[PDB]
């Protein structure tokens, strides 16, 4: 291992992260803290109608479009991680299949404070209470994300940090179905090393930021798991629930 390469990798990943995800933590936080006329607050059924077939199904059918596009962008990110393009195309699929939603919820955290979540690329703000007030099991989709986002946002990671942490999540050599995990671990071990260095310089006063961040990686796996389970309860009930084929492609056998 060489510090120059590890730092080259950090900077490489950051520039590629900038060039791949139009929505960064820096833009989301600038909106959330008012330093950026202003997002439209959605806190009830009526101002949801003013914000612009049941309401709960409708609040979430629109999000699919951004999910699909996040799958597109995460994929253009994974193609920039040194070594990924040469892995067996089958492992490339599996790494995106399991990685994509862990990274989405990592990025969704930037959009969240304890009180709510930015919507429509920050043109709206939908309150947590309102999401909590929805019916069926619909009003339990977002509350686990808020509890995570509050704890995760407390790490004070920035877009430099996130680029590498997200790359580490993609290069997870323990997902079901990888063909040979050996080259995946060599990439990730090295990514983990850039992270440790990255966090040690960017945050010299957060003693064990590295350990606390590794433990959030497992939190992200449980969020996806519960989320996938809630989807199963809906598919048994809501006839009005359809899913984009890319998302349906990802959720099957997950």
């Amino acid at each position: 291992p060489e510090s120059a390469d590890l730092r080259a990798l950090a900077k490489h990943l950051y520039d590629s992260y900038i060039k791949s995800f139009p929505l960064t933590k820096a833009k989301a936080r600038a909106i959330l803290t008012g330093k950026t006329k202003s997002p439209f607050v959605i806190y009830d059924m009526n101002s949801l109608m003013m914000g612009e077939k049941e309401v709960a199904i409708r609040i979430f059918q629109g999000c699919q479009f951004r999910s699909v596009e996040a799958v597109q962008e995460i994929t253009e990110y994974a193609k920039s991680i040194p070594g990924f393009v040469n892995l067996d195309l089958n492992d490339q699929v599996t790494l995106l299949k399991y990685g994509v939603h862990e990274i989405i919820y990592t990025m969704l955290a930037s959009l969240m404070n304890k009180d709510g979540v930015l919507i429509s690329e920050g043109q709206g703000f939908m309150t947590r209470e309102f999401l909590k007030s929805l019916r069926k099991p619909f009003g339990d989709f977002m509350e686990p994300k808020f509890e995570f986002a509050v704890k995760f946002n407390a790490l004070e990671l920035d877009d430099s940090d996130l680029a590498i942490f997200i790359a580490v999540i993609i290069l997870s050599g323990d997902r079901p179905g990888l063909l040979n995990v050996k080259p995946i671990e060599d990439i990730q071990d090295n990514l983990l090393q850039a992270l440790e260095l990255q966090l040690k310089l960017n945050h010299p006063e957060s003693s064990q930021l590295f350990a606390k961040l590794l433990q959030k990686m497992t939190d992200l796996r449980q969020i996806v798991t519960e989320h996938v389970q809630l989807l199963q309860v809906i598919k048994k009930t809501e006839t009005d629930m359809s899913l984009h084929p890319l998302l349906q492609e990802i959720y099957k056998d997950l």
């Binding site: 597109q72 195309l89 490339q92 995106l96 084929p245 492609e249």
Partner: peptide, 11 residues
């Protein structure tokens, strides 16, 4: 394989 959209998104 059976993820054909993702397969296509990669090349």
């Amino acid at each position: 394989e059976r993820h054909k959209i993702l397969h296509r998104l990669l090349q």
